[PDB]
Design a protein around this ligand. Structure first.
Ligand SMILES: *[C@@H]1O[C@H](CO)[C@@H](O)[C@H](O)[C@H]1NC(C)=O
Ligand SMILES: *[C@@H]1O[C@H](CO)[C@@H](O)[C@H](O)[C@H]1NC(C)=O
Lengths: 215, 215
């Protein structure tokens, strides 16, 4: 297990998008994990559709929230998920318009990472790929993030409310970190990405909901 | 295990091509198997490049012959294979021009089917997908094939010289068969396909070299 990894450099990460006024953060995270795994299994980087998840995952809340595990389960039981080109993101709720002919990726279940265990998360990122996680984004310090390794002892490490995609880890000037891909556009953070305090005892609760799809 | 299957109907089979004046039959077979498996793993049907195999598999003979297993091993160790669009078929030998950025499929080893065991071949086709095989095509009866279930007791069930892709099995008017995809264009056989005598004691030696890739 490497001391550093950046899946952005391995071509596992799709360009940063903006979820707009819609709680589809879980959709982008799930789509990102499935994209990374699709890349790992095929070698082809292909933008999958979070909108498909928003509309067709009937056990999530569409633009009102949801989980990544439920999305993976959806992709598995439905027998596929559409590409971004075939099923574009519009940022609002609508009926399920899944085109099975536009099928571009499949799933075979999911795996959850043991709560509180950042070691298992690092091992996962190392051996699996971009891991779908969820953190506490409510703090203005996160809203105003722009550079460095993010940390705040006020950050809730127990209650969690925002899905992002861990695309690697490393260290910047002594401070260990998680590289996270957010869905608030390139106008937020470091062009859509952020560095999060690693090994600071589950900072922002990055291990409360860490999951990844199988292919 | 079904009594019949047609992967052409499941959208696992790429349109029939013509290998021209080049012994790249093994390339089309391997590419076909990898295409079927790529479809099974992703749900996307994508034409892979036999030319890539012809040029880059250095343990085969290019347009002079080769094995499918060696091709699978190539795709595995090289870490990918190009699409047909990126690496078109030209029907002649040339240098390896593999574009790793054009990577569209990967492999993780291969499996050979026990020689003489058509049962294991049927089970394979059922549980895996289109199986790369090789048969005896030398007979004029095969060259002039057009309809029915092909059979000839003069067909060599021991010595084998032509790679095709078993894309399913079934029965036509009492006679059990293997659906095979050849690479002699749509101007041969049933628009490029043929039905081969099944359970006629390894007819044309269809189990002498039956193999499939893993993904
Ligand atoms: C479904 O999606 C495919 C994606 O390639 C598209 O080509 C086709 O026009 C669509 N057809 C239907 C059934 O709406
Ligand atoms: C390699 O292939 C890719 C396939 O998309 C193509 O876009 C690119 O122009 C090629 N580049 C090189 C290194 O020749």
């Amino acid at each position: 297990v490497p001391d550093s990894i950046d899946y952005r450099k391995k071509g596992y990460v799709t360009p940063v998008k903006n979820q707009g006024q819609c709680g589809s953060c879980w959709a982008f995270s799930s789509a990102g994990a499935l994209e990374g795994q699709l890349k790992k299994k095929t070698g082809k980087l292909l933008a999958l559709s979070p909108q498909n998840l928003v509309d067709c995952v009937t056990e999530n809340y569409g633009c009102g929230g949801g989980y990544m595990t439920t999305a993976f389960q959806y992709v598995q039981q439905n027998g596929g998920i559409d590409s971004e080109d075939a099923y574009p993101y519009v940022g609002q709720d609508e009926s399920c318009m899944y085109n099975a002919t536009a099928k571009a990726a499949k799933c075979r279940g999911y795996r959850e990472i043991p709560v509180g265990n950042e070691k298992a998360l690092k091992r996962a990122v190392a051996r699996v790929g971009p891991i779908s996680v969820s953190i506490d984004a409510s703090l203005a310090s996160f809203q105003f993030y722009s550079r460095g390794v993010y940390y705040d002892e006020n950050c809730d490490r127990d209650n969690v409310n925002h899905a992002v995609l861990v695309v690697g880890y490393g260290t910047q000037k002594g401070s260990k970190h998680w590289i996270i891909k957010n869905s608030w556009g390139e106008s937020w953070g470091n062009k859509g990405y952020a560095l999060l305090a690693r090994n600071k005892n589950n900072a922002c609760g990055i291990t409360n909901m860490a999951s990844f799809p199988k292919m």
